[PDB]
Amino acid sequence: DLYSRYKKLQQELEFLEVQEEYIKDEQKNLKKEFLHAQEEVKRIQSIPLVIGQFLEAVDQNTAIVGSTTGSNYYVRILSTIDRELLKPNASVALHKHSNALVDVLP
Amino acid sequence: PKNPDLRIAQLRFLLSLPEHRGDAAVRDELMAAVRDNNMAPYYEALCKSLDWQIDVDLLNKMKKANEDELKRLDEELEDAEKNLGESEIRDAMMAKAEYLCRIGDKEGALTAFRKTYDKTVALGHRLDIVFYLLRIGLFYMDNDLITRNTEKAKSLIEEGGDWDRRNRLKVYQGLYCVAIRDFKQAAELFLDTVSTFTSYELMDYKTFVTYTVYVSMIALERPDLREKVIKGAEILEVLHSLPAVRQYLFSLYECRYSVFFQSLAVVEQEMKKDWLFAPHYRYYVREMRIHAYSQLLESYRSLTLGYMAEAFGVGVEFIDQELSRFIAAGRLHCKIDKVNEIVETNRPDSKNWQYQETIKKGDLLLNRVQKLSRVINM
Amino acid sequence: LFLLSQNRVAEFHTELERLPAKDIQTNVYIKHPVSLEQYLMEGSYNKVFLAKGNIPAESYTFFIDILLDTIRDEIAGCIEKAYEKILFTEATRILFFNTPKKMTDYAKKRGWVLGPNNYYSFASQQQKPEDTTIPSTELAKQVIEYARQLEMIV
Amino acid sequence: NYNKAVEEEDKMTPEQLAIKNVGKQDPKRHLEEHVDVLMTSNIVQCLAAMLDTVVFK
Amino acid sequence: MSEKKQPVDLGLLEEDDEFEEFPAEDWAGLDEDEDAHVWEDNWDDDNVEDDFSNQLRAELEKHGYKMETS
Amino acid sequence: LEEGKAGSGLRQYYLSKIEELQLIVNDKSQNLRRLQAQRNELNAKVRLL
Amino acid sequence: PPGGGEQEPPPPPAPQDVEMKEEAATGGGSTGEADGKTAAAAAEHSQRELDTVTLEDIKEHVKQLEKAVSGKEPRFVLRALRMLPSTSRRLNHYVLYKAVQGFFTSNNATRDFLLPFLEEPMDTEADLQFRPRTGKAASTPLLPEVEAYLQLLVVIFMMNSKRYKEAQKISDDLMQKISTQNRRALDLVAAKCYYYHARVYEFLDKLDVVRSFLHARLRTATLRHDADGQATLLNLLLRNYLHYSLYDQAEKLVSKSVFPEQANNNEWARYLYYTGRIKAIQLEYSEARRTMTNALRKAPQHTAVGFKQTVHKLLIVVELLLGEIPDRLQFRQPSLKRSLMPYFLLTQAVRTGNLAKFNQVLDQFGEKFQADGTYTLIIRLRHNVIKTGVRMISLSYSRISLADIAQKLQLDSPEDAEFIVAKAIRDGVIEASINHEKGYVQSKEMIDIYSTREPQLAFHQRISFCLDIHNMSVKAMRFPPKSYNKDL
Amino acid sequence: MILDKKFHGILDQGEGVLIIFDEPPVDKTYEAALETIQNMSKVVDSLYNKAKKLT
C-alpha cells in the first residue's frame, strides 16, 4: 500500500495526461463549430424583408410588433439585439419569412 | 483685503530686496500706514523698515483705535445676536472679519470667516466668503489654503456665471495660474477680458493686461496669437496705452531681433521686482529665447553665421555656446555641425518620429503591464 | 601589476575595495598603482613617461617598464585604429623612439599598405548592406512563431 | 475609429464597475468585437510573410 | 521580507539628528517659492539657474554693451 | 536500513511533487473543461436558436 | 499619581483584541483551512502571513508593558494539548485559562520564564497530529515579540532562541522533507528568521557556521523547488557577499542558473537591487541602468520611499558616469530630497565639469558620500569629469580649436588634446572622422537616428522583442483566468 | 508664410536650396496616440480597482 501508491498512481498519471490532447481537440473543434453555427444563423438574416412598426414591449426578450397591414404580431425578439432597439415608437423591420428584426431604421 | 492696503502692503517685496527703490515704497507705505489699520503688517515687516524713533509714536494710537473699533464691532455683534435674522449676523461677523483682515490677523479672521462660513444661507455668499479668503491669500501667498475652499466651492454652483462673480473667480484663476508655471491651460482664462473691468480690489485692468501679456506673448505660438489676440480687438484697444507692448508684439511677430534685443532690457528689468512675477523670471527668459530660436529655426534648414549674426545683432562667440547648450540642454532639433561653420540641421521629426512619438508610451505602458503582471497572484 | 598586465583590469576595478584598508595611505607605492591605473582610465601616456623618473630607488622600475612593454600593444593598437586616416607626423610624437621596431613588427602583424610616408586605412565602412532576402525569411519564421504563440492553445 | 468609439464608453465603464459591481445590464460585451477587429488586423501579419516569399523567390 | 528597512530608517534618523529642522526651514526658504510648482520644470529651471548662479546670471543687460563691442 | 524512510521517503516526496504537477494538469483540465462547458453552452444556445 | 494611576489600565488592553483575534483567525483559519487537504490548497495563507508581518513591523506594542503587563509572555497556544480526541473539556479550558488570569491579578515576569519553552514540544506541540504546521505556526510568530529590543543583553537570549529553533525543527528538520504548505512556507519562515538574527550575526561575529551550513541546507532545498524560498535564502548569502566577500570567480557568472519563477512581488526589486549592486562595480552602462531603474520603479506595495532612496542614490551615481544625469523629476517625497541634498551640488556640478574648483568642492564638505567606503567610484569620477566633459564636446560642435575650446576644457596643449579625444574615440560610444589635412582634427559626428537609414534592421529586434514581451503578457492574461476558473 | 504653413517649402541662406515635401498619412499617428492616451486611463483605472481591492 505504501510503495504501491507510486505505480498504482502512475495509471492516474496516464489517465489524466491523456485528457490534454483531448481537451485540445474539443477546444479547437467546438469553436470551429461555433463559427459554423454562428455564420449559419448569421446568413439567415437576409436584406429583402418587410418593414413593420413596434407597439409595446410586454417583458424581456419578447414583445409585440404591428405589421404594415394593421394586424399586430407577437414575435420573440432575437437575443443579439440589445435593449436600445426596444423603443416603443421606433421603425422596426422584421423578415419577410422569418419575421425577425435585425436593425431599426432612423 | 479688498482695500488698497493689499497693494500698498504688497509693495513690500520691492521694498525688501532692492535698496534703490526702497524709498517710494516706504514713502507711500509710511504715509498709507494710517489707513486700513496698517499697524500689524508694517510692525511685522518692521525689520525691513526704519528705526524705532518715529515707529513707537503712532503705535499707541493705532493699538487703542484697534481695540475701540474692535469692541464696537463686538458690541454691534452682541446687539445683532439674540434676534431673529440671518443677514444681520452675517454682516456683523463679516464686517468684524473684514476689520480683522484690515489688521492682518488670520486667526480671528479664520475663525470669523469660519463662523460666517457656517452661517452661509446660500452658495453665492459662500463663494463671496471664499473670495474674501482669496484676497488675503494673495498677500499670504499660501498654496493649499486658497485651493481648498475653491476646490470645494467650485462644484455645485447651479446659479450660472454672473457678470463679476464668475469673472472675478476667473481672475483669481489667472492669479494662481500665473503663480504656477501652468500655461497651456492658463491660456484660456484671459479670454473673457471683454467683460473684465477696473477691479481696485485685487489688480487694475492695465495691470491685468500687463500681467497677461507675458503668458499670452510667450505661452502662445503664432497661430495661437493670430487666432486669439491678433484677431481680437482687445489688444488693439489696449495697445494705445503703452507703445512698448506694440513693439514687443509686432517685433516678435515680425521676427526683428535687432530691436527686440535692444528693447528686451525693459522686459528684463520689469520682469523682476514684482510680487508674484519675480521668482519666475528665469523661466520666461529661457523659454522665450528657445521659443524664438525654434520660431526662426523652424522655417530655416541651414543658416550661415553672417545672416544670423546680422539678424540677431550679437557676436558668434555667444550663439556658439547658446546652440551648444540648446542641443543637449534645450533639445529643440537634431545635432548641429560646424564642418563648414554654418548652422545646418536636418530635423527628421515628422516621417519616422511622428510614428515614434508613441514608443515612450509603449515603454511606459510596457512597464505598466509588467506591473499588471506584478498584480498577478498577490 | 599582474592584473593590469594580463588585461584583467576589470578584476582591478572590482578589486579596488579591499585595498583601502587605511593601513599607511601616505607611501607613494600605496597610491602608485591606483594613480597609474586611473591614468590608464585617462589613457594619457605622456604623464607616465614624464613620471618615469618620479619613482624612488625602489627596484620595481624595470617591472613598470615590463608593464609599459605589455600595454604598448594596446596603446599603440588603439592609437593606430585608423577609422579614416592618420598622418605619420603625429605617430612620430605619439609613438616611441626612432627605433624602427613598430614599423617592422607592425608591418608583419597588422599587414597593411605603406604609402608615401603615410598610413592608409582600408576596409573602413565598406561593408555592403544586405539584400533584404534573408531578413524577410526570418521575418516569415517570426510570423510562424506569431501564429504559434498567438494560436497554440487555441 | 470604432475602437476609440468604444473606448470613449470604456472610459465611463470603471465608474459603474467602481460603484455597483453587482449584476449586468448592458447586453454588449465589448470584448469579442475587439477580438474580431484583431482577427481582421492580423491579415497584415499573415500576409507579411507572403510578401516576404514573393520578394524572396 | 521588509525587515531590512529598519536600519535604513535608523540612518534616516541619524541624518535627521544631524541638523534639527535646519534643512527643512533653510530649504523651505526656496520651497515656499517652489511649493505647488511642477517639479519636472524645476529640474531645467534649477539646472540653468544653478548653472548661471556663478557668473552671467542675467546677461541680458550686458548685450546692450556687447552689441557695439562684438 | 534508513532507506524506506529516507531514500523511498524522498522518492515519495518527489511523488508528492508529481502529484503537484498532476494538480496543475488536474485544475487545467478543470478550468479548461469549465470553459469548454461555457462554449458548449453558448453554441448549444444558438443551436436552440 | 491620579493621572497615571486612574488612566493606567485603559492603555494596555488595546492590542489584546486584535492580537488574540489575529492569532486565532490566522491560526484557526490556516489550520482549519488546510486541515482537510493541506497538500491540495497551497499558497493561500502566504500573502496573509507576509501581509501580517509587514503589518506588524511598525507595531508600537511594547512601550510601557515592562511593569506588570508582561502576562502575555508566559501564556501560549494551549489548543487541544495532551490529547487529540475528546476536546470538549479543552474547549471549556479555552475560556477557563483565559478567565483565570482576569479575576484579581496575575503573577507575571519578563526574563524568568524564557528558557523552558520546550516543555510541550517534547511530547506534543499542539495536538500530536499537525505537529509541523502547528509547531512552526505556534512558535515562530510569538518568538520575535519576546526577542524584540535586540540590545540590552538579549543577544544571548537570541542565541537560546536559535538553539531552540534548530534543536526543535531546523537542526536539519523535524522530518527530512515536510513537502507541504508548511514546507514551502517554512522556507520563507526560516529565511525570515535568518534575516531576524542576521543583525546578531553581523553584530559581533561573522560567517563561519550558519550561512556556510546554508549551502548544504540550500541543496539538501531540493532541486525541484520553484526556487522562491531557495532564492530568498540566496539573498542573505549575496548580501553577506555584498559588504566584503570580493571574490567574483564563482557567484559572478556561475551563480547564474536556470532562474525559475522567483518574484515574491518584492524579490525582483530587492534581489535585482542586490545583483545590480554587485554588477555596479564594473561600471555597467547598458544592463544595470535599465534593469536597476526598472527595479526602482518596482515594489510599490508597502513603501517606495524609505527603501528606494539607496537604489536611487546608486542609480544616479552610476547615471552621472555616462554624462547624462537625470535628477528627481516625477517622484515627490521628503526622503530622497534630504538624501540628495549633500550630493545635489556635485551631481549638478558634473555637467559643467570644472576640475580644479569642484575637486576642492568634493572633499570640502564631503562627509558621507565619501565616507561610504573605499571612495572607489568617486575616485574614478575625479578623472571621469573630463571624460563626461569631452563627451559633452562630442555632443557639441565638430571642429576643435587650440585656444577657445582647449582653454575652455582647462587643457591647453596640442598633443594631449587629440590624444585624449582619441581616447574618447576608441570607446565606440561616439562617431567621428579622424582626418589630418592642415593640422586641425575634424569629425563628422553624425548622430542622425535610424530614420530612413536601414529601418527594418534597426527596429526589427524592437518588433520581435516587444512582441515577445507583450505576447508573454498575453500568456499573463490567459493563465490567471485559468487560475480563476480552476475552482469552479 | 512657411511659418504660416500655407504651402510646403523651406528656405536656405548658405546654399539657397529649396525642398518641398509632404506627409500624407496624418490620420494614423493621431488615432494611435489617442488610443494610447485613452488606454493609459484604462490600465491606471484597472490598477486603481485592483489596488483598491487588494490593499
PDB file of C-alpha atoms in Angstrom, chain B residues 7-33 38 42 48-50 273:
ATOM      1  CA  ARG B   7      -1.277  96.638  -2.971  1.00  0.00           C
ATOM      2  CA  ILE B   8       0.462  99.070  -0.605  1.00  0.00           C
ATOM      3  CA  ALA B   9       1.346  96.157   1.681  1.00  0.00           C
ATOM      4  CA  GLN B  10       2.069  94.162  -1.500  1.00  0.00           C
ATOM      5  CA  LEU B  11       4.924  96.501  -2.485  1.00  0.00           C
ATOM      6  CA  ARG B  12       6.919  95.040   0.431  1.00  0.00           C
ATOM      7  CA  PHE B  13       8.708  92.701  -1.994  1.00  0.00           C
ATOM      8  CA  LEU B  14      10.321  95.567  -3.906  1.00  0.00           C
ATOM      9  CA  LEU B  15      10.654  97.330  -0.547  1.00  0.00           C
ATOM     10  CA  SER B  16      12.675  94.403   0.843  1.00  0.00           C
ATOM     11  CA  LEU B  17      15.191  93.074  -1.685  1.00  0.00           C
ATOM     12  CA  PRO B  18      16.412  96.180  -3.581  1.00  0.00           C
ATOM     13  CA  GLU B  19      17.794  99.162  -1.697  1.00  0.00           C
ATOM     14  CA  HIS B  20      17.341 101.659  -4.549  1.00  0.00           C
ATOM     15  CA  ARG B  21      13.535 101.618  -4.867  1.00  0.00           C
ATOM     16  CA  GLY B  22      13.056 101.223  -1.104  1.00  0.00           C
ATOM     17  CA  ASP B  23      12.342 104.952  -0.763  1.00  0.00           C
ATOM     18  CA  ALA B  24       8.979 105.394  -2.500  1.00  0.00           C
ATOM     19  CA  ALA B  25       7.639 102.095  -1.140  1.00  0.00           C
ATOM     20  CA  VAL B  26       8.372 103.217   2.419  1.00  0.00           C
ATOM     21  CA  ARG B  27       7.108 106.689   1.474  1.00  0.00           C
ATOM     22  CA  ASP B  28       3.609 105.561   0.486  1.00  0.00           C
ATOM     23  CA  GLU B  29       3.839 102.696   2.993  1.00  0.00           C
ATOM     24  CA  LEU B  30       4.508 105.056   5.906  1.00  0.00           C
ATOM     25  CA  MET B  31       2.075 107.628   4.503  1.00  0.00           C
ATOM     26  CA  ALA B  32      -0.542 104.912   3.914  1.00  0.00           C
ATOM     27  CA  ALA B  33       0.147 103.292   7.304  1.00  0.00           C
ATOM     28  CA  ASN B  38      -1.830  99.032   8.783  1.00  0.00           C
ATOM     29  CA  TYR B  42       4.339  97.012   8.925  1.00  0.00           C
ATOM     30  CA  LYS B  48      12.802  95.738   6.686  1.00  0.00           C
ATOM     31  CA  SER B  49      11.933  99.287   7.806  1.00  0.00           C
ATOM     32  CA  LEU B  50      13.489 102.317   9.515  1.00  0.00           C
ATOM     33  CA  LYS B 273      10.830  93.410  -8.713  1.00  0.00           C
TER      34      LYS B 273
END
